[PDB]
Write an enzyme that holds these catalytic residues in place. Structure first.
Site, PDB file in Angstrom:
ATOM      1  N   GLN A 117      -9.136  17.622  -1.467  1.00  0.00           N
ATOM      2  CA  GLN A 117      -7.788  17.372  -1.998  1.00  0.00           C
ATOM      3  C   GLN A 117      -7.608  15.994  -2.631  1.00  0.00           C
ATOM      4  OE1 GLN A 117      -5.657  18.570   1.824  1.00  0.00           O
ATOM      5  NE2 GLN A 117      -4.180  19.387   0.364  1.00  0.00           N
ATOM      6  N   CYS A 129      -7.095  23.804   8.623  1.00  0.00           N
ATOM      7  CA  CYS A 129      -6.352  22.573   8.848  1.00  0.00           C
ATOM      8  C   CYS A 129      -4.888  22.917   8.590  1.00  0.00           C
ATOM      9  CB  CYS A 129      -6.939  21.454   7.986  1.00  0.00           C
ATOM     10  SG  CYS A 129      -7.210  21.884   6.202  1.00  0.00           S
ATOM     11  N   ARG A 143      -9.456  18.918   4.649  1.00  0.00           N
ATOM     12  CA  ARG A 143     -10.416  18.784   5.757  1.00  0.00           C
ATOM     13  C   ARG A 143     -11.310  20.023   5.897  1.00  0.00           C
ATOM     14  NH1 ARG A 143      -5.873  16.510  10.097  1.00  0.00           N
ATOM     15  NH2 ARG A 143      -4.952  15.018   8.594  1.00  0.00           N
ATOM     16  N   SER A 144     -10.727  21.218   5.748  1.00  0.00           N
ATOM     17  CA  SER A 144     -11.503  22.459   5.868  1.00  0.00           C
ATOM     18  C   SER A 144     -12.614  22.524   4.818  1.00  0.00           C
ATOM     19  CB  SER A 144     -10.574  23.678   5.728  1.00  0.00           C
ATOM     20  OG  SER A 144      -9.697  23.820   6.847  1.00  0.00           O
ATOM     21  N   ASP A 177      -3.923  10.300  10.651  1.00  0.00           N
ATOM     22  CA  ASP A 177      -2.750  10.836   9.950  1.00  0.00           C
ATOM     23  C   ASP A 177      -2.815  10.558   8.445  1.00  0.00           C
ATOM     24  OD1 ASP A 177      -1.408  11.978  12.223  1.00  0.00           O
ATOM     25  OD2 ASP A 177       0.340  10.695  12.031  1.00  0.00           O
TER      26      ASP A 177
END
Ligand SMILES: CN1CC[C@@H](c2ccc(F)cc2)[C@H](CO)C1
EC number: 3.1.3.48
Length: 282
Positions: free
Chosen positions: A262, A215, A221-222, A181
């Site tokens: 990010q 994502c 994440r992508s 998370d």
């Protein structure tokens, strides 16, 4: 510089935030006018994440052709990817329309439906064989065929039917279920194992349309997934694998979608994954 020793040099000097901010400063800025039209407000999950006009995927529809999705085309590596946000309640039918129209074989999902106590994307595939889904706005039917649950990821076989033509296709759903998370994984080993399973399926290969990867926003994440895949492929193709410059590859990918990677922690994790992955390939 090479990668593994550039890596230790940034760790020892603690300058990951400065490296990452340089990338942000040098990244391309292209218009995203279609994304910002008022009629598309409920088609975007986040107001600050939009596809560029020049690389956006168009739906084959004359009313409204808009979806928050971008085509990343890597010329030297000879790989293409579609990066998209997690589907919204009012875009699940558009999502599967895109999969159909672009002839994709595989969908790669890097998030859970609920994280941090909030919904990160819609439940857009069926959970039981006998309870199929019909998307009436785009005239598609989706059936769960089989499901294989492993410790870090799940693979599902789905049948997508175009109800207008009665054509059917098999779609593979690759679901990475264990990204934490907060932060990034401590080791890249399970993420790399997952990438190799997607590769082995044929979903990334030129005989199919581009893989669809998402994502929640479709950039963090992508971005890590496609950046690691492309860097490892280039290390196999080139005479000198130490010439592969992960910062340059990332800036090339950011010509096609804004914001890929990010955080500075995601940047460090991408380096780690490519470094460890290059040892296993040989
Ligand atoms: C959001 N962003 C703002 C700046 C724009 C731009 C305009 C003219 C240029 F020469 C260079 C950048 C860009 C494309 O319109 C969109």
């Amino acid at each position: 510089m090479e990668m593994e020793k550039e890596f230790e040099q940034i760790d020892k000097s603690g300058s990951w935030a400065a490296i990452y901010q340089d990338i942000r400063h040098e990244a391309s800025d292209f218009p995203s006018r279609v994304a910002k039209l008022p009629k598309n407000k409920n088609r975007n999950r986040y107001r600050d994440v939009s596809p560029f006009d020049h690389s956006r995927i168009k739906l084959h529809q004359e009313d409204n052709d808009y979806i928050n999705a971008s085509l990343i085309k890597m010329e030297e590596a000879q790989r293409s990817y579609i990066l998209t946000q997690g589907p919204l309640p009012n875009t699940v039918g558009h999502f599967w329309e895109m999969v159909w129209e672009q002839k994709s074989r595989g969908v790669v999902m890097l998030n859970r439906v609920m994280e941090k106590g909030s919904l990160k994307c819609a439940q857009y595939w069926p959970q039981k064989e006998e309870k199929e889904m019909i998307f009436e706005d785009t005239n598609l039917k989706l059936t769960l065929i089989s499901e294989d649950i492993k410790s870090y990821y799940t693979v599902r076989q789905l049948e997508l039917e175009n109800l207008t033509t009665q054509e059917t296709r098999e779609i593979l759903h690759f679901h990475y279920t264990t990204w934490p998370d907060f932060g990034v994984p401590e080791s890249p080993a399970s993420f790399l194992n997952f990438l190799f399973k997607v590769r082995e399926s044929g979903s990334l290969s030129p005989e199919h349309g581009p893989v669809v990867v998402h994502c929640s926003a479709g950039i963090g994440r992508s971005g890590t997934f496609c950046l690691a895949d492309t860097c490892l492929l280039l290390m196999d193709k080139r005479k000198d694998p130490s010439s592969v410059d992960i910062k340059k590859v990332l800036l090339e990918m950011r010509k096609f979608r804004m914001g890929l990677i990010q955080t500075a922690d995601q940047l460090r994790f991408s380096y780690l994954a490519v470094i460890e992955g290059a040892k296993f390939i040989m």
